[PDB]
Write a protein that binds this ligand. Structure first.
Ligand SMILES: [Cl-]
Ligand SMILES: [Cl-]
Ligand SMILES: [Cl-]
Length: 468
């Protein structure tokens, strides 16, 4: 009853816009209990470049946007790669030509681009017609195409009529007669164009709803004409928001990390990204932003898709990441954090100690790559700081006092108070110097939490090492 698809052209990196579009299809499919199809637009890719498809699928599974039908999982409406469907598109292109709805063209791609510019220089519209290509239909050119392994490109006769798109998000989009001209549906190298392959697959795969970025709205005119050519009712269209950077301009390189792979490498969580990606072109009825994946599926709907653009907020994504990172189960937070420590040179053998070190320091990190430098003092002894003159005697006495004591603040704190009062040393300056002895920094977690986690041996060793 309900069938949606994500149709990416794999480049190796799944960007935020793609990830967002795949999420909206996933949520809709899950809510309505329909199917979510993955279609790889690998027409121009080589056999060697299948690793881009492997990386895009990996990133979708990392985000948890699992699909029902696809190149690996299979399905009754396959194959799911456009490279493997070349004969299906050819079969459909020739059918339009036989019905007088399309036609063959023998002009090169280096040419056409010449007459494109000739029409523009002459003030005319850049709209193609069948009579414009008759110049190139000569026996010499047909021989040159045969001898060079080329086929004539198939062009679609664009009819002189109005097309009305009743979009779910954008509403009524009138494409007035004489907007565009004739266009290429099959190229001279035997491969299809995006629009033609898109329509043939949307029909054959029985797509009910096409949810995609609004940058494909112009292309919908070319697709609606093709649906009419094949005499098949088109699917429901939902054109989602354009993702802009924080300054208003289109999201890009200059705005920071743009790929799902880049966020994973920096240390972002899938639940954080998915929740944030959900907010780029949709809102919860009551404006709720911290939603679980179950909450998104339940609350999501096509009537709440914004017709306006989504502005990317890196601070909000990073803050939202910190939220999930702190409320995540410690068992899971440990396995996700461990590689960042190993990459940073800190080796982790004690699993119980590691969970305790992360439980304290998690309140100070928003991203997983921040953990190693923040929690470094808990593993490696810091640089020895010069203990001031009046306290040298106080710090040296602590080795003796704290030797026969249970290693807990309830027993350690009264010993500090006794020695400080006895010597006539103010506590503010003692606790400041003690931080520098144990941590080697001006700030960090509460000293009450740091001291007990480190051993008695680790506490005393750092005092004597700092000055002696
Ligand atoms: Cl698409
Ligand atoms: Cl061509
Ligand atoms: Cl302090």
């Amino acid at each position: 009853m309900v069938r949606v698809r994500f149709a990416p052209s794999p480049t190796g990196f799944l960007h935020v816009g793609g990830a967002r579009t795949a999420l909206f299809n996933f949520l809709f499919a899950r809510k309505e209990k329909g199917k979510f199809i993955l279609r790889i637009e690998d027409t121009d890719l080589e056999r060697s470049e299948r690793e881009y498809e492997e990386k895009l699928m990996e990133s979708l599974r990392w985000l948890g946007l699992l699909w029902d039908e696809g190149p690996d999982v299979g399905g009754d409406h396959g194959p799911y790669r456009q490279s493997e469907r070349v004969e299906i598109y050819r079969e459909h292109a020739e059918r339009l030509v036989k019905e007088g709805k399309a036609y063959y063209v023998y002009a090169y791609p280096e040419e056409i681009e010449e007459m494109r510019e000739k029409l523009l220089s002459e003030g005319k519209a850049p709209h193609y017609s069948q009579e414009m290509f008759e110049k190139f239909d000569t026996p010499e050119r047909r021989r040159e195409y045969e001898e060079k392994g080329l086929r004539p490109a198939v062009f679609f006769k664009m009819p002189r009529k109005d097309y009305v798109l009743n979009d779910v998000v954008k509403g009524e989009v009138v494409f007035k007669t004489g907007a565009i001209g004739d266009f290429v549906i099959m190229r001279s190298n035997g491969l299809p164009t995006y629009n033609f392959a898109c329509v043939v697959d949307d029909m054959l795969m029985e797509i009910t709803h096409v949810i995609r970025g609004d940058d494909h709205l112009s292309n919908t005119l070319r697709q609606l004409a093709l649906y009419e050519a094949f005499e098949k009712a088109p699917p429901v269209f939902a054109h989602v928001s354009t993702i802009l950077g924080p300054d208003g301009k289109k999201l890009s390189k200059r705005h920071g990390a743009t790929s799902v792979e880049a966020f994973r490498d920096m240390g972002y969580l899938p639940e954080a990204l998915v929740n944030y990606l959900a907010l780029l072109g949709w809102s919860h009825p009551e404006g709720k932003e911290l939603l679980t994946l179950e909450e998104l599926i339940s609350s999501f709907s096509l009537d709440r898709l914004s017709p306006n653009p989504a502005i990317f907020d890196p601070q909000k994504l990073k803050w939202m990441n910190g939220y999930y990172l702190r409320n995540m189960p410690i068992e899971k937070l440990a396995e996700l954090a461990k590689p960042f420590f190993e990459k940073a040179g800190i080796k982790i053998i004690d699993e119980e100690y590691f969970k305790k070190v992360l439980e304290i320091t998690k309140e100070r990190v928003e991203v997983l790559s921040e953990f190693p430098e923040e929690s470094r003092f808990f593993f490696e002894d810091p640089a020895p700081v010069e203990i001031p003159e009046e306290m040298k005697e106080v710090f040296s006495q602590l080795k003796e006092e704290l030797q026969n004591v249970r290693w807990t603040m309830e027993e350690i704190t009264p010993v500090f108070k006794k020695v400080l009062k006895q010597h006539g040393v103010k506590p503010k300056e003692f606790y400041m110097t003690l931080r520098r002895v144990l941590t080697g920094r001006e700030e960090g977690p509460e000293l009450v939490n740091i001291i007990p986690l480190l051993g008695k041996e680790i506490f005393l060793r750092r005092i004597e090492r700092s000055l002696g």
